[model samples]
Target: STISRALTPSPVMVLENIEPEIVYAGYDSSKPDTAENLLSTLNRLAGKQMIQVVKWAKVLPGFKNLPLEDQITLIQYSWMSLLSFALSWRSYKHTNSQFLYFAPDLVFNEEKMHQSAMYELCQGMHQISLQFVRLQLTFEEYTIMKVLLLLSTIPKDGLKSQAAFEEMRTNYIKELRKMVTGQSWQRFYQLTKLLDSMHDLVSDLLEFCFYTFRESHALKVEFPAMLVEIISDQLPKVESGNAKPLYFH
Candidate 1:
């Protein structure tokens, strides 16, 4: 059942999509990299990936088996997950932080920065990946999450984690290729930097922090059970004449 949940949705959303509302909140070029900026960045990057897939899929002899609309839908869904992933990461980082871990020589400073910073990276990593769970992605996308979780669990170090990430990246491309065969998926994946920004973050984190054993010292220290707290804050309260989405019947 664990694998089933990991592999597939329990019941898929049957609602058909209409044209997206196209939410846009403009960003200033001078002050890029803010949360507001992520909207445009994600929109552009998602569109680029979509176009690449559509163009490449068409070149294949029988790629028409998948309707163009379906291709667009996949890209749209994937992009929403991607943006949510990025936003959640940034949110966690902003809310939870320890500045001194990056400066190891100051480990013995007056503050307990080591303990704080150690778990920061790991929690950030986990929370960012968990955003995908909120998206309720399709079965194929869940496969992507499993591979990512695998890579995320590996000790960040040397070629081990990087290799695992690369393997994940490769597998992601391979999975996408299954739907949009030929060289389009491959070519689309090849363009990094802008398009693969999320992967780029994962790769850098793997390369930088995965190997350190000292990071786990803080894990043994108890932190309050805040997941329930978060859930409590998020739970919707029913008012007069309200309809609830939850069905326990």
Candidate 2:
């Protein structure tokens, strides 16, 4: 019986597979690094990341049980937050959290941040990456936090399967607690406060994103169709004030 139990993988192991090695942003580093070029390249990288984030969400243990419509709503609402959380982890791991590691090739140091013409937004994102490093963030913490970020937002009207959505959210929160090997309530507190802080940074990011998107021609930047579609669809909902993001505070 002990051997049979050993053969059965734990539920935690199942969830572990959902977070994988990230894909690269298709940025051509050789190109001239003008403001427009840098912005357009990040947009393309985001487009690539969106595809992976969606695929990753599809495989989450409880994600598919909700109505398909609910699935779309959840991803559409939280995509920006998800990327910020995810990319910050990448920065922490690769650049020791010194740069905003949007991709392996597209990493942004302080000067690149200034050059992007989005210095404010870029530094805020880099700030988060540094937060990850300072906390010595664990992979388990990163995985559950990323999942929570995905589950944390919703339409004000609620989803078609609001009950199911809440159930998934509740289960993941418990999972996050279980993964807290530190056993320090203070660590939990810090992690949670950090989650709340992601919103302020992302709010500014969305503003810069929307402005660049609307002024693409004038700014001489470009967006991939994938990035364009998500932003275009998401812009109105956020503008309407219905995309309610959750917070611990």
Candidate 3:
């Protein structure tokens, strides 16, 4: 008779339930492992994940409440960082953070890492994955971090509803704080520090991405139209220093 509560749930469980479905990179590993092939394969997954990213934002609790322009700008500015952050989580959960877990089929090992041409960038992403292991990063923390990454970057002029944007962001911060409730201040400090550490490294990723975009023809790498849309618009602003990223550090 004492079994009455019956799985009273938490908000985070709902969040985890709503998290986007797993995506496959569509990489044909049987093909030759050339540098160009590997790079393109990674880009292929980026494009696939990009779709889920947009859908995730649309359904995310407060994201749709923003003005349409703000929604576009936030996603446009932070897409690369979002993809990279998820890559780290995938890497951590599936590969013990040793390799890049881009997707179930398209996982990148050492040899593929060398073949990506941006070996340095690959290593940086892997380092982020390692941090996930050290933190014993839970899926709930990662879901919140993904939301924070979207809100972190913005147009230099701020969003159309800057106040609304900031409030949503701080709400997520409080959600994260709640996760660290029983823990000491050190837990929250380390999580935010982990987030702060992502920016410069992600800037490096964007630089490499832009380079590849400009030279996609020469390099034989192709990006889907959706990926092209965000990248093309973002490349100019990023190069011109018009995009701004917020930092907890």
Q: Cα deviation of 236 in candidate 3 (Å)?
A: 1.3
Per residue, candidate 2 scores C-alpha lDDT tens digits across 1-249 of: 999999865546665776666777777878888888888888888888888887787788889989998898888888888988888888898889878888877888888988889998877777888888788998788888888888878898888998988898888778777777535777888888998888888788888888888888888889999988888888888899988888888
- Candidate 2, run of 10 with poorest lDDT: 9-18
Pairs clashing within candidate 3: none
Candidate of highest lDDT: 3
Compared with the true structure, what per-residue lDDT tens digits does model 1 show for residues 1-249? 988778753211111121122232222346434322332333344344334333433442222333454333233223223333433433333333222111111111113323334344445444443443443233344333322322222111222234433554465445544533346544334322123344444434433322221232342321122312221222221112121121111
By TM-score, highest first, what's the ranking?
Answer: 3, 2, 1
Q: Which stretches of candidate 3 lie above 4 Å from their native place? A: 1-11
Segments in model 2 whose C-alpha atoms lie over 4 Å from true places: 1-11
What is the per-residue lDDT of model 3 for residues 5-61, given as tens digits with 9 covering 90 to 100?
A: 557445566568778877987888688988888888888788888888888887787
C-alpha lDDT of residue 248 in model 3: 96
Per-candidate total of colliding backbone pairs = 2, 0, 0
TM-score of each: 0.23, 0.93, 0.93
**Candidate 1 overall lDDT versus native:** 0.32
